[PDB]
Design a binder for this molecule. Sequence first.
Ligand code: A2G
Ligand code: A2G
Length: 7
Amino acid sequence: PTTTPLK
Ligand SMILES: *[C@H]1O[C@H](CO)[C@H](O)[C@H](O)[C@H]1NC(C)=O
Ligand SMILES: *[C@H]1O[C@H](CO)[C@H](O)[C@H](O)[C@H]1NC(C)=O
């Protein structure tokens, strides 16, 4: 589970 800096 990984995402980019908010929007
Ligand atoms: C990426 O988005 C997810 C889902 O909102 C989480 O907030 C996660 O903490 C985010 N990653 C970063 C590096 O901000
Ligand atoms: C972070 O940016 C990436 C593009 O590299 C994706 O668009 C991802 O969906 C973004 N995450 C959020 C939480 O907007």
